[PDB]
Amino acid sequence: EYPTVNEIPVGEVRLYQIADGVWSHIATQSFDGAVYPSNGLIVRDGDELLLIDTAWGAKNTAALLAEIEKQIGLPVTRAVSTHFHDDRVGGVDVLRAAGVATYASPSTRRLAEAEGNEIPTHSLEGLSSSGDAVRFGPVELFYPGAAHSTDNLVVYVPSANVLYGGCAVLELSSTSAGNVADADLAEWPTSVERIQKHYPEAEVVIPGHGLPGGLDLLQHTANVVKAHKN
Ligand code: NA
Ligand code: NA
Ligand SMILES: [Zn+2]
């Protein structure tokens, strides 16, 4: 019953409970004439919530906050963007205006600025080298190395064994790595291997787009990217 574009009209947001205090948020995007669902994460921390990634753009992200208040009824106090592309930082201004403290690595913030995208307010230090990990409220942030982008982060929820990969992880039904304009195809399989090695106890893996599954999404991702590199 994980929602797809056939269940979410363009511009709508849904939540899906993955585990106690862990949800994905799913929003249908329209981009370059294609329509597709994008995932992010919500994690409970006491009586507050941590948000991972926006819903792409001001209107979608406002709709996300509305859906969270309806379904969960706890305030979002902090948000993290997993890389600099407009789909993951677009909407940060809505978050910030709503009182959410927004975060990203310094690399993500620089790249977003240089692109003319919205820029998270706060820097996350300690994530500049492959294998680097930092605790942030109820999650661990991990920099696996360059993959979909050079700055991409993944997020682990230790209490629930849930890994959110952002666009560095592909769904099982995927046959291509998607937009690779800012990707490092040579490094990406190695970066996935770091994730595999560091989180061998992950039970649920959530890709940037599409259906969650188990740890096999990681090996599948490496395989697709390697086959792409042809
Ligand atoms: Na969109
Ligand atoms: Na962008
Ligand atoms: Zn991207």
DSSP letter for each residue of 174-230: --S----TT--TTTHHHHHHHHHHH-TT--EEEESSS--B-THHHHHHHHHHHHHT-
62: three-class secondary structure by DSSP: helix
Q: Quote the distance between the C-alpha of residue 187 and its chain's center.
A: 19
Task: Give the separation between CA 81 and CA 140, rounded to whole angstroms.
Answer: 14
Q: Which sequence positions are flagged as catalytic?
A: 83, 85, 87, 148, 179
**Distant-in-sequence, close-in-space partners of 104: CB < 8 Å, separation ≥ 6:** 80, 81, 84, 89, 112, 119, 120, 122, 123, 124
**What are the tokens at 111?**
């790249």
Total residues found in the chain within this entry: 230
86: three-class secondary structure by DSSP: helix
- Gap from CA of 30 to ligand 3 centroid (Å): 15
Method in brief:
X-ray
65: three-class secondary structure by DSSP: helix
**Ligand that lies nearest to the alpha carbon of residue 88, given by its number in the listed order:** 3
Order of strands across the sheet that contains 162-166:
132-136, 139-143, 154-157, 162-166, 204-207
Residues whose beta carbons lie less than 5 angstroms from ion ligand 3: 85, 167
CB-based contact 76:95 (threshold 8 Å) = yes
| Beta bridge mates, 133 | 142
Q: Please, what is the Cα angle at 207 between 84 and 82, to 5 degrees? A: 20
**What are the tokens at 202?**
């992950």
- Gap from CA of 170 to ligand 3 centroid (Å): 12
**What are the tokens at 144?**
């696996």
**Distant-in-sequence, close-in-space partners of 164: CB < 8 Å, separation ≥ 6:** 24, 39, 40, 41, 52, 82, 154, 155, 156, 157, 205, 206
Radius of gyration of the chain (CA): 16
Indicate the pairing of strand 22-31 with strand 34-45: antiparallel
Given in angstroms, what resolution was this structure solved at?
1.5
**Ligand that lies nearest to the alpha carbon of residue 181, given by its number in the listed order:** 3
**Distant-in-sequence, close-in-space partners of 109: CB < 8 Å, separation ≥ 6:** 84, 119, 120, 123
Question: For residue 225, what are the CA distances in angstroms to 55, 170, 211, 215?
Answer: 25, 10, 18, 16
| Beta bridge mates, 52 | 41, 80
**Ligand that lies nearest to the alpha carbon of residue 167, given by its number in the listed order:** 3
Question: For residue 156, what are the CA distances in angstroms to 159, 161, 204?
Answer: 9, 7, 10
Q: Please, what is the Cα angle at 229 between 109 and 185, to 5 degrees? A: 20
**Distant-in-sequence, close-in-space partners of 73: CB < 8 Å, separation ≥ 6:** none
CB-based contact 166:181 (threshold 8 Å) = no
Residue 198 annotated as binding site: no
- Gap from CA of 179 to ligand 3 centroid (Å): 7
Task: Give the separation between CA 114 and CA 44, rounded to whole angstroms.
Answer: 33
Number of neighbouring beta carbons within 10 Å of residue 66: 11
Name the CATH superfamily housing domain 1-230.
Ribonuclease Z/Hydroxyacylglutathione hydrolase-like (3.60.15.10)
Indicate the pairing of strand 204-207 with strand 34-45: unpaired
Angle between helices 188-198 and 216-228 (to 10 degrees): 170
**What are the tokens at 200?**
């061998």
